Design a binder for these strands. Structure first.
Length: 314
DNA sequence: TTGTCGCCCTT
DNA sequence: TAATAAGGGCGACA
């Protein structure tokens, strides 16, 4: 994986474009098959044959913020997507332990890291909010879970509203009713009398990483799971409620819309970067809608988990 | 003795 | 559209 430097359709071994590579160099095969976007500068193209480019990183260049941007081949992306099946199943098998951890700690002291993590984990499994790295709060004013501040928590005598601007300037509103098990512990954690402070003031990126490590997943996996679970809940409800029934094609489209709105991102992004491919393939089958119809949601969730488990050949 | 930071990869 | 932005995860650094 030698680094080669790109400039105006031709390739060099040199930082400042003296000394061009060989004419027959395999990298030129790659350049026939991909277009370097012209908004980039300092473009590096990796010397390899097209067939190997397919499978991994292809080139990287700097956008106008000065950020390094990374471009991958179609096989790399395919493997990426194929992983969502296993993640969905993986999270599903640790939910019982996650809840167990949550409920052990939510009766604890207000400034206990474990109590704070418990709440963190319960907001996450409830609303699928992104991790919220400090970095993006400084750079872009983006708030996610870890970067939530007391000003983002509005208290009413019957509900708590969490309101904040997340990724891509998208505005989010989540609501916690009195009956919700998040009410009591969230009201206890937040301090009205200092709005400029972080909600999870005893946590940090490192604390979260260490804590989640025990379930063998990453916070983003909780979000990937939440999107699939919500899809399944809506799909199940839709089949269960909607006048005779539309085509599976349109039933998936509706379920994806509903799910995307709950989660708060576009339908296209939901289908493409979140949904387990097997679920998407499984639900197309018309005969399968008979199966769904006669089930409680729990036995439905199980059928899907099982099929994804074993169609994944594991 | 821990809060940034770069690199890679994801959305 | 057609052009191409901004998130997370992990480990090194002082």
């Amino acid at each position: 994986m030698r680094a080669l430097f790109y400039k105006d359709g031709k390739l060099f071994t040199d930082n400042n474009f003296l000394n061009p590579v060989s004419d027959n160099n395999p990298a030129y095969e790659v350049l026939q098959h991909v277009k370097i976007p012209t908004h980039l500068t300092d473009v590096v193209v990796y010397g390899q044959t097209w067939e190997e480019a397919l499978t991994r990183l292809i080139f990287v260049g700097s956008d106008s913020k000065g950020r390094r941007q990374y471009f991958y081949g179609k096989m790399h992306v395919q493997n990426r997507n194929a992983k969502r099946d296993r993640i969905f199943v993986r999270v599903y098998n640790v939910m019982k332990r996650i809840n167990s951890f949550i409920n052990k700690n939510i009766k604890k002291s207000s400034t206990d890291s474990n109590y704070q993590l418990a709440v963190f984990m319960l907001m996450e499994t409830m609303f699928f909010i992104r991790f919220g790295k400090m970095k993006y709060l400084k750079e872009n004013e983006t708030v996610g879970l870890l970067t939530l501040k007391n000003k983002h928590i509005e208290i009413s005598p019957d509900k708590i509203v969490i309101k904040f601007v997340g990724k891509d300037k998208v505005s989010h509103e989540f609501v916690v009713h009195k009956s919700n098990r998040l009410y009591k512990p969230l009201l206890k954690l937040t301090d009205d009398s200092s709005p400029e402070e972080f909600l999870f003031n005893k946590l940090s990126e490192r604390k979260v990483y260490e804590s989640i490590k025990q379930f063998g997943i990453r916070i983003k996996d909780l979000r990937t799971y939440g999107v699939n679970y919500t899809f399944l809940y809506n799909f199940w409800t839709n089949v269960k409620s909607i006048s005779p029934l539309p085509s599976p094609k349109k039933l998936i489209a509706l379920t994806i819309k509903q799910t995307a709105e709950v989660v708060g991102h576009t339908p296209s992004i939901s289908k493409r970067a979140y949904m387990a491919t097997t679920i998407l393939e499984m639900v197309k089958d018309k005969n399968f809608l008979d199966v769904v119809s006669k089930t409680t949601f729990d036995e439905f969730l199980s059928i899907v988990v099982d099929h994804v488990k074993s169609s994944t050949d594991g």
